[PDB]
Amino acid sequence: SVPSQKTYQGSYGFRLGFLHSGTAKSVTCTYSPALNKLFCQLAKTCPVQLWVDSTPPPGTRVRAMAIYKQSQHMTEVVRRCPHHERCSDSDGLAPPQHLIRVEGNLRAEYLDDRNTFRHSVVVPCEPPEVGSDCTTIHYNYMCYSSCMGGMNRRPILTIITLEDSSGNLLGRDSFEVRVCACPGRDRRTEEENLR
Ligand SMILES: [Zn+2]
Protein backbone atom coordinates (compact mmCIF):
# COMPACT_ATOMS: atom_id res chain seq x y z
CA SER A 1 0.00 0.00 0.00
CA VAL A 2 2.99 2.26 0.71
CA PRO A 3 6.52 2.07 -0.75
CA SER A 4 9.35 2.00 1.81
CA GLN A 5 11.41 5.16 2.21
CA LYS A 6 14.12 3.66 4.45
CA THR A 7 17.64 4.75 3.48
CA TYR A 8 19.67 1.69 2.52
CA GLN A 9 23.14 1.89 1.01
CA GLY A 10 23.35 -1.82 0.30
CA SER A 11 26.33 -3.82 -0.93
CA TYR A 12 27.41 -1.17 -3.40
CA GLY A 13 27.30 1.82 -1.03
CA PHE A 14 24.55 3.57 -2.96
CA ARG A 15 23.61 7.16 -2.12
CA LEU A 16 22.54 10.38 -3.82
CA GLY A 17 24.42 13.65 -4.29
CA PHE A 18 23.24 17.17 -5.12
CA LEU A 19 24.93 20.23 -6.61
CA HIS A 20 25.42 23.44 -4.59
CA SER A 21 23.32 25.89 -6.59
CA GLY A 22 22.72 28.60 -4.02
CA THR A 23 19.55 30.51 -3.23
CA ALA A 24 19.58 33.48 -5.62
CA LYS A 25 16.02 34.40 -6.62
CA SER A 26 16.95 33.35 -10.18
CA VAL A 27 17.92 29.76 -9.30
CA THR A 28 15.80 27.05 -10.99
CA CYS A 29 16.77 24.09 -8.81
CA THR A 30 18.40 24.06 -5.39
CA TYR A 31 18.94 21.47 -2.68
CA SER A 32 18.82 21.98 1.05
CA PRO A 33 20.94 19.50 3.04
CA ALA A 34 19.48 20.73 6.38
CA LEU A 35 15.95 19.97 5.18
CA ASN A 36 16.92 17.06 2.81
CA LYS A 37 14.69 18.87 0.35
CA LEU A 38 15.00 19.81 -3.32
CA PHE A 39 13.26 23.04 -4.45
CA CYS A 40 12.70 23.42 -8.21
CA GLN A 41 10.74 25.23 -10.86
CA LEU A 42 8.15 23.49 -13.01
CA ALA A 43 9.64 21.25 -15.72
CA LYS A 44 13.20 22.46 -15.16
CA THR A 45 16.30 20.27 -15.02
CA CYS A 46 16.99 18.70 -11.62
CA PRO A 47 20.48 17.13 -11.59
CA VAL A 48 20.66 14.21 -9.15
CA GLN A 49 23.98 12.44 -8.66
CA LEU A 50 24.34 8.69 -8.08
CA TRP A 51 27.31 7.55 -6.01
CA VAL A 52 28.52 4.02 -5.31
CA ASP A 53 31.57 2.55 -3.59
CA SER A 54 31.75 -0.43 -5.95
CA THR A 55 30.39 -1.20 -9.41
CA PRO A 56 26.99 -2.91 -9.47
CA PRO A 57 26.29 -5.71 -11.98
CA PRO A 58 25.39 -5.19 -15.65
CA GLY A 59 21.60 -4.83 -15.81
CA THR A 60 21.30 -2.75 -12.61
CA ARG A 61 18.68 0.02 -12.91
CA VAL A 62 17.71 3.21 -11.06
CA ARG A 63 14.04 3.99 -10.38
CA ALA A 64 12.35 7.21 -9.19
CA MET A 65 8.88 7.34 -7.60
CA ALA A 66 7.01 10.05 -5.72
CA ILE A 67 4.88 9.48 -2.63
CA TYR A 68 3.08 11.93 -0.34
CA LYS A 69 5.14 12.71 2.77
CA GLN A 70 2.22 12.97 5.24
CA SER A 71 1.06 9.58 6.48
CA GLN A 72 -2.63 10.37 6.05
CA HIS A 73 -2.03 10.84 2.32
CA MET A 74 0.59 8.18 1.70
CA THR A 75 -1.74 5.63 0.12
CA GLU A 76 -2.81 8.14 -2.54
CA VAL A 77 -1.01 7.87 -5.87
CA VAL A 78 1.00 11.03 -6.65
CA ARG A 79 0.00 12.15 -10.16
CA ARG A 80 -0.27 15.26 -12.29
CA CYS A 81 -3.31 17.48 -11.73
CA PRO A 82 -6.42 17.59 -13.95
CA HIS A 83 -4.95 20.51 -15.87
CA HIS A 84 -1.41 19.31 -16.44
CA GLU A 85 -2.29 15.75 -17.40
CA ARG A 86 -4.24 17.34 -20.34
CA CYS A 87 -1.84 20.03 -21.54
CA SER A 88 -0.22 17.91 -24.27
CA ASP A 89 3.36 18.63 -23.20
CA SER A 90 4.38 15.04 -23.93
CA ASP A 91 8.04 14.38 -24.68
CA GLY A 92 7.02 11.32 -26.66
CA LEU A 93 7.81 8.76 -23.97
CA ALA A 94 6.42 9.86 -20.60
CA PRO A 95 2.69 9.21 -20.04
CA PRO A 96 0.95 12.60 -19.56
CA GLN A 97 -0.12 11.59 -16.03
CA HIS A 98 3.41 11.09 -14.70
CA LEU A 99 4.83 13.72 -12.37
CA ILE A 100 8.47 12.67 -12.71
CA ARG A 101 10.25 12.46 -16.05
CA VAL A 102 13.83 11.69 -16.93
CA GLU A 103 15.35 14.14 -19.44
CA GLY A 104 17.58 13.12 -22.32
CA ASN A 105 17.64 9.37 -21.90
CA LEU A 106 16.04 7.32 -24.66
CA ARG A 107 16.33 4.20 -22.48
CA ALA A 108 14.02 5.55 -19.78
CA GLU A 109 10.99 3.35 -19.13
CA TYR A 110 7.77 4.54 -17.51
CA LEU A 111 5.78 2.15 -15.36
CA ASP A 112 2.11 2.25 -14.34
CA ASP A 113 2.12 -0.46 -11.63
CA ARG A 114 -0.63 -2.95 -12.36
CA ASN A 115 -1.28 -3.58 -8.65
CA THR A 116 -0.60 -0.29 -6.87
CA PHE A 117 -1.30 2.03 -9.81
CA ARG A 118 1.75 4.05 -8.80
CA HIS A 119 3.95 5.72 -11.40
CA SER A 120 7.69 5.48 -11.73
CA VAL A 121 10.49 6.08 -14.24
CA VAL A 122 13.47 3.77 -14.45
CA VAL A 123 16.77 3.92 -16.37
CA PRO A 124 19.83 1.70 -16.70
CA CYS A 125 22.51 2.43 -14.06
CA GLU A 126 25.46 3.69 -16.14
CA PRO A 127 29.02 4.21 -14.99
CA PRO A 128 30.47 7.74 -14.88
CA GLU A 129 32.00 9.26 -18.03
CA VAL A 130 35.80 9.10 -18.09
CA GLY A 131 37.01 11.88 -15.82
CA SER A 132 33.91 11.84 -13.61
CA ASP A 133 33.47 10.30 -10.16
CA CYS A 134 29.68 9.90 -10.34
CA THR A 135 26.77 9.62 -12.73
CA THR A 136 24.01 12.21 -12.95
CA ILE A 137 20.36 11.71 -13.88
CA HIS A 138 18.36 14.77 -14.96
CA TYR A 139 14.80 14.73 -13.62
CA ASN A 140 11.87 17.06 -14.36
CA TYR A 141 8.83 17.54 -12.07
CA MET A 142 5.74 18.27 -14.12
CA CYS A 143 3.30 19.88 -11.67
CA TYR A 144 3.66 22.54 -8.97
CA SER A 145 3.27 21.39 -5.36
CA SER A 146 0.30 23.81 -5.25
CA CYS A 147 -1.61 22.41 -8.26
CA MET A 148 -5.27 22.12 -7.40
CA GLY A 149 -6.77 18.68 -7.84
CA GLY A 150 -3.26 17.21 -7.84
CA MET A 151 -0.62 17.57 -5.13
CA ASN A 152 -2.73 20.47 -3.78
CA ARG A 153 -0.01 21.91 -1.51
CA ARG A 154 0.81 18.52 0.04
CA PRO A 155 4.55 17.80 0.35
CA ILE A 156 5.99 14.82 -1.51
CA LEU A 157 9.13 12.72 -1.28
CA THR A 158 10.99 11.24 -4.24
CA ILE A 159 12.34 7.73 -3.53
CA ILE A 160 15.29 6.61 -5.66
CA THR A 161 15.92 2.87 -5.70
CA LEU A 162 18.88 0.97 -7.12
CA GLU A 163 17.47 -2.34 -8.44
CA ASP A 164 18.78 -5.52 -10.02
CA SER A 165 17.52 -6.75 -13.41
CA SER A 166 14.45 -8.43 -11.77
CA GLY A 167 13.53 -5.28 -9.86
CA ASN A 168 14.86 -6.50 -6.50
CA LEU A 169 16.16 -3.86 -4.07
CA LEU A 170 19.90 -3.12 -4.03
CA GLY A 171 19.82 0.35 -2.48
CA ARG A 172 17.52 3.23 -1.58
CA ASP A 173 17.68 6.97 -0.84
CA SER A 174 15.09 9.77 -0.83
CA PHE A 175 14.48 13.49 -0.54
CA GLU A 176 11.53 15.83 -0.11
CA VAL A 177 10.58 17.96 -3.17
CA ARG A 178 8.78 21.31 -3.48
CA VAL A 179 7.98 22.41 -7.06
CA CYS A 180 7.46 26.14 -6.92
CA ALA A 181 7.95 29.43 -8.68
CA CYS A 182 10.86 30.72 -6.61
CA PRO A 183 13.01 27.86 -5.25
CA GLY A 184 15.72 30.17 -3.94
CA ARG A 185 13.40 32.26 -1.83
CA ASP A 186 11.45 29.26 -0.58
CA ARG A 187 14.61 27.40 0.40
CA ARG A 188 15.83 30.45 2.35
CA THR A 189 12.45 30.81 4.07
CA GLU A 190 12.20 27.17 5.10
CA GLU A 191 15.79 27.01 6.34
CA GLU A 192 15.15 30.13 8.40
CA ASN A 193 11.97 28.59 9.82
CA LEU A 194 13.96 25.47 10.76
CA ARG A 195 16.64 27.58 12.43
ZN1 LIG B 1 -0.42 20.63 -12.25
UniProtKB/Swiss-Prot annotation:
Changing D133A: In sporadic cancers; somatic mutation. Changing P127T: In sporadic cancers; somatic mutation. Changing P96R: In sporadic cancers; somatic mutation. Changing P47T: In sporadic cancers; somatic mutation. This is Cellular tumor antigen p53. Changing L162V: In sporadic cancers; somatic mutation. Changing T136S: In sporadic cancers; somatic mutation. Changing S165C: In sporadic cancers; somatic mutation. Residues 18-141 are annotated as: Required for interaction with FBXO42. Changing R154G: In sporadic cancers; somatic mutation. Changing G131A: In sporadic cancers; somatic mutation. Changing F14C: In sporadic cancers; somatic mutation. Changing P57T: In sporadic cancers; somatic mutation. Changing L50P: In sporadic cancers; somatic mutation. Changing A181G: In sporadic cancers; somatic mutation. Changing C40R: In sporadic cancers; somatic mutation. Changing H73P: In sporadic cancers; somatic mutation. Changing Q49R: In sporadic cancers; somatic mutation. Changing D89H: In sporadic cancers; somatic mutation. The modification Phosphothreonine is found at T189. Changing C147F: In sporadic cancers; somatic mutation. Changing D113N: In sporadic cancers; somatic mutation. Changing S145P: In a sporadic cancer; somatic mutation.
